[PDB]
Design an enzyme around this catalytic site. Structure first.
Site, PDB file in Angstrom:
ATOM      1  N   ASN A  80       2.121   1.637   7.841  1.00 54.55           N
ATOM      2  CA  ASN A  80       2.471   0.674   8.758  1.00 54.55           C
ATOM      3  C   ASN A  80       2.246  -0.598   8.244  1.00 54.55           C
ATOM      4  O   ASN A  80       1.691  -0.927   7.239  1.00 54.55           O
ATOM      5  CB  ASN A  80       1.290   0.689   9.573  1.00 54.55           C
ATOM      6  N   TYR A 102      -8.576   3.215   8.477  1.00 51.18           N
ATOM      7  CA  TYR A 102      -8.288   3.371   6.893  1.00 51.18           C
ATOM      8  C   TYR A 102      -9.615   3.940   6.117  1.00 51.18           C
ATOM      9  O   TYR A 102     -10.723   4.479   6.562  1.00 51.18           O
ATOM     10  CB  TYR A 102      -7.932   1.852   6.430  1.00 51.18           C
ATOM     11  N   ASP A 130      -1.249   5.919  -5.449  1.00 49.97           N
ATOM     12  CA  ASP A 130      -1.594   5.099  -4.404  1.00 49.97           C
ATOM     13  C   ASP A 130      -1.991   3.550  -4.678  1.00 49.97           C
ATOM     14  O   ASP A 130      -3.019   3.524  -5.312  1.00 49.97           O
ATOM     15  CB  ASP A 130      -2.774   5.642  -3.396  1.00 49.97           C
ATOM     16  N   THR A 173      -5.494   1.963  -3.606  1.00 46.77           N
ATOM     17  CA  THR A 173      -6.645   2.598  -4.008  1.00 46.77           C
ATOM     18  C   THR A 173      -7.028   1.875  -5.563  1.00 46.77           C
ATOM     19  O   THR A 173      -6.301   1.996  -6.235  1.00 46.77           O
ATOM     20  CB  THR A 173      -6.991   3.815  -3.972  1.00 46.77           C
ATOM     21  N   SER A 225      -0.246   4.397   2.653  1.00 51.37           N
ATOM     22  CA  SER A 225      -0.038   4.154   4.256  1.00 51.37           C
ATOM     23  C   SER A 225       1.326   3.634   4.545  1.00 51.37           C
ATOM     24  O   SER A 225       1.981   3.452   3.662  1.00 51.37           O
ATOM     25  CB  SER A 225      -1.057   3.159   4.751  1.00 51.37           C
ATOM     26  N   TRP A 249       0.979  -4.286   9.557  1.00 51.80           N
ATOM     27  CA  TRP A 249       0.218  -5.121  10.564  1.00 51.80           C
ATOM     28  C   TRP A 249      -0.217  -6.274  10.000  1.00 51.80           C
ATOM     29  O   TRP A 249      -0.407  -6.345   8.796  1.00 51.80           O
ATOM     30  CB  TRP A 249      -0.686  -4.255  11.001  1.00 51.80           C
ATOM     31  N   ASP A 282       0.847  -1.254  -0.079  1.00 54.14           N
ATOM     32  CA  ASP A 282       0.059   0.135   0.033  1.00 54.14           C
ATOM     33  C   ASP A 282       0.830   1.298   0.035  1.00 54.14           C
ATOM     34  O   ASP A 282       1.369   1.603   0.947  1.00 54.14           O
ATOM     35  CB  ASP A 282      -0.795  -0.187   1.225  1.00 54.14           C
TER      36      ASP A 282
END
Length: 326
Positions: free
Chosen positions: A37, A75, A215, A218, A35, A39, A32
């Site tokens: 992070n 998100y 991005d 998306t 963003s 996880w 992504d």
């Protein structure tokens, strides 16, 4: 160089398998660029979405180190809450040692229940990281595990194999011609200036510049609702009974290209790209969505755009490179 293959899921989601722990437990995550992070879900999670995705178990990893730090990520549609841990992450053939990552305790609601991936691996700047957690690519660079401080993305079309993230390098065979470079304006997202959007030589939107983020996470071209409305009418799209933005499939032959001018270079997006075929139906690849930032109204150049242009994300010089896919 160091290639991470991605799976193309219906031209809408692109994800790949990474390892966490010793021996590696495997997860699929969205790569992504919107963003920062990493996880994945954990054994601590009992939410709906945690019932049908892979769950990291800290106890089966001999390299796992815990912390007492928490993370929340909100998100586009989903959200998680969890704790932060360190372990070794296998991404793109690389042993990314001492990687901080999110383990979920809750993944509220249901959007994530339907998603085909387990978690998310962000490729944007550390300043938009929740709880300031070091992003994966930052960790790989600080440990000198790649020779160049950039990565590349090739997204394939029509459900095909071949999509790839290349860490630390560029491969020429994925594009035609030479790269042009766009400076990043605000470091957080991969944020760039669009000078204008034209169709048949006329500025149908963003007539005097606007901000956009490149991005991978998306699916569609996204803009503020009003200028999107103008674009939807110019391509002859219409709201149907059940809300969807439909266009007649005849249109793909006769509509002009829509051109994004970025740093004085024109990037055409043909109707075979910005009109999506669901075989029985053709829908617009443009979607209205107001994202308020300090920057004002953001456009999102999502998978629709990225499929047409091999994209280089250059952290050394803070710039984005674009050239037509081969």
């Amino acid at each position: 160089v160091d290639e991470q293959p991605l799976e193309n899921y219906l031209d809408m989601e692109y994800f790949g398998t990474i390892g966490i722990g010793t021996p590696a437990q495997d997860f699929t995550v969205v790569f992504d660029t919107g963003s920062s992070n990493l996880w994945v879900p954990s054994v601590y999670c009992s939410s709906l979405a945690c019932t049908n995705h892979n769950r990291f178990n800290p106890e089966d990893s001999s390299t796992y180190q815990s912390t007492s730090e928490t993370v929340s990520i909100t998100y586009g549609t989903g959200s998680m809450t969890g704790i932060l841990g360190y372990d070794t992450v296998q991404v793109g053939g690389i042993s990314d040692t001492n990687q901080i990552f999110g383990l979920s305790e809750t993944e509220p609601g249901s959007f994530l229940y339907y998603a085909p991936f387990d978690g998310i691996l962000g490729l944007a700047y550390p300043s938009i990281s929740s709880s300031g957690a070091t992003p994966v690519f930052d960790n790989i660079w600080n440990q000198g595990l790649v020779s160049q401080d950039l990565f590349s993305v090739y997204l394939s079309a029509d459900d095909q194999s071949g999509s790839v993230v290349i860490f630390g390098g560029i491969d020429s065979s994925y594009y035609t011609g030479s790269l042009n470079w766009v400076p990043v304006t605000v470091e957080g997202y991969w944020q760039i200036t669009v000078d204008s959007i034209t169709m048949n030589g006329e500025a149908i939107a963003c007539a005097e510049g606007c901000q956009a983020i490149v991005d991978t996470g998306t699916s569609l071209l996204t803009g503020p609702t009003s200028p999107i409305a103008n674009i939807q009418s110019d391509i002859g799209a219409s709201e149907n009974s059940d809300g969807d933005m439909v266009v007649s499939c005849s249109a793909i032959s006769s509509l002009p290209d829509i051109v994004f001018t970025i740093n004085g270079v024109q990037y055409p997006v043909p109707p075979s790209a910005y009109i999506l075929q669901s075989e029985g139906s053709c829908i617009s690849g443009f979607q209205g969505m107001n994202l308020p930032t300090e920057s004002g109204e953001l456009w999102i150049l999502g998978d629709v755009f990225i499929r047409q242009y091999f994209t280089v994300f250059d952290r050394a010089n803070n710039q984005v490179g674009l050239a037509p896919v081969a």
